[PDB]
Amino acid sequence: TTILAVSYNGGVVLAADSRTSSGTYVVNRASNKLTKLTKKIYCCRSGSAADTQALAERVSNYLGSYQTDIGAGVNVATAANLFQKMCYMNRWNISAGIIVAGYDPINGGSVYSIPSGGSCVKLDYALGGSGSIFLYSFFDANYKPGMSKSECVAFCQRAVAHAYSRDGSSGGLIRTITLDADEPEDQTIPWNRSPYCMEKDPKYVTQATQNQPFSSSAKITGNRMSSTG
């Protein structure tokens, strides 16, 4: 499970994998971890699936009522605070890491990270899930703030493809969504079109010389690939 959100000028870009696994078996290979709360606020949920689904739908049911009552759009701080409160008074029973990202006309685009513990940190870019730790040292190197909308979604897809290539718990479709002043737009690039994969990476084409032929010299010359040879 890998989820991430990156903020740019206009709004935010959410990206995530699509695979729920039972430890070592792919239960669902086309899952959807980007849950909408409002029209312009989404959440990427990681950890357990039942707990985060209950939380997402409870908070979205709250947000629908607040917005109808006040009659004007909802900030992202509201939704992030609701999530933090809930995931804080259930912190012993649930294992739920949330990334709440959205756009409001007041403060532009915003990304909040609510980890397992239950805190709430408002960031410029957030990562989460079991396969995240492979992305930190990817963002420290290849990421610069102030990107455009298109280059942002390209970088997000690239980050997720580098995260689920090495991680076992992650994989499948790459699902991204862009939230900004215009309509929120979605995109799902499959695995057979991903911007990276360790099978098509030409540095992993030549194999490790492990099966040495029974030979007379100590020169290593590659594997033994047939019985005659």
Binding site: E57, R58, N61, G64, S65, T68, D69, G71
Partner: protein, 245 residues
């Protein structure tokens, strides 16, 4: 045997006097609303008159939105209506939270009618003096299209669908005009502009003042945009000028 009319009890001839006096509270504030539905849309027009000229002309209203898809007008005692909306809104969230779909319109009308019947049974509570009209568009089955709906709930709880309802001050003259207009044409075949012309003509027939644009607010639900929304004065003026001929 002395009072018979200060609490919820039956009087000798078989009437609930507190529910018979709650029909005189709706017609008290002198407001009048007309809701109509054409082939593709629902319109609700209400008098929105602020005789005082120091009051914000956009603060006091009658149209509320119960759900993104269902709106309502509240005729009668002004605060009551407001409170009622809150109840409706609550029942939506529960429903929206407990079953996972947005609440139908007939279900909301039935539940808001039942809540009204409970007050007419216990001695303590006072019946809500407000004739609520929920307008919306519902999913029609076996074809998937959206069908317009207008539901009315009284202080007693007499919920009912409608083709065109009128509520409030001089509502009988408005209903008579609508009935006379219906005997000729077919309301479920008219278009939105004609329907709004008929609604405005009924309202101007019931009060007889040839209303201007700033005294009425119009709310609409359309098959194209299913959400309830109120239409600007730049559109109501176009129907006023057309009724003028």
């Amino acid at each position: 045997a002395g009072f018979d009319k200060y609490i919820t009890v039956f009087s000798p001839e078989g009437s609930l006097y507190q529910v018979e006096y709650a029909f005189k509270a709706v017609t008290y504030p002198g407001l009048l609303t007309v809701a109509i539905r054409c082939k593709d849309a629902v319109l609700v027009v209400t008098q929105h008159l602020i005789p005082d000229r120091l009051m914000r002309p956009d603060s006091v209203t009658a149209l509320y939105e119960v759900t993104p898809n269902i709106g309502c007008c509240m005729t009668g005692r002004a605060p009551d209506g407001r409170a009622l909306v809150q109840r409706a809104r609550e029942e939506a969230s529960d429903y929206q939270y407990r079953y996972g779909v947005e609440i139908p319109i007939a279900v909301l009308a039935k539940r808001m009618g039942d809540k009204a019947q409970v007050r007419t049974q216990q001695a303590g509570l006072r019946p809500m003096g407000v004739v609520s009209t929920f307008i919306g568009m519902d999913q029609s089955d076996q074809d998937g299209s959206l069908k317009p709906q207008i539901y009315t709930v009284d202080p007693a709880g007499w919920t009912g669908g409608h083709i065109a309802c009128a509520a409030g001050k001089k509502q009988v003259e408005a209903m008579a005009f609508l009935e006379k207009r219906q005997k000729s044409t077919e309301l479920d075949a008219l278009t939105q502009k004609e329907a709004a012309m008929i609604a405005l003509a009924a309202l101007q027939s019931a009060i007889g003042t040839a209303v201007k644009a700033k005294e009425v607010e119009v709310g609409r639900c359309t098959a194209a945009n299913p959400a309830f929304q109120r239409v600007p004065n730049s559109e109501v003026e176009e129907w006023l000028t057309a009724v003028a001929e």
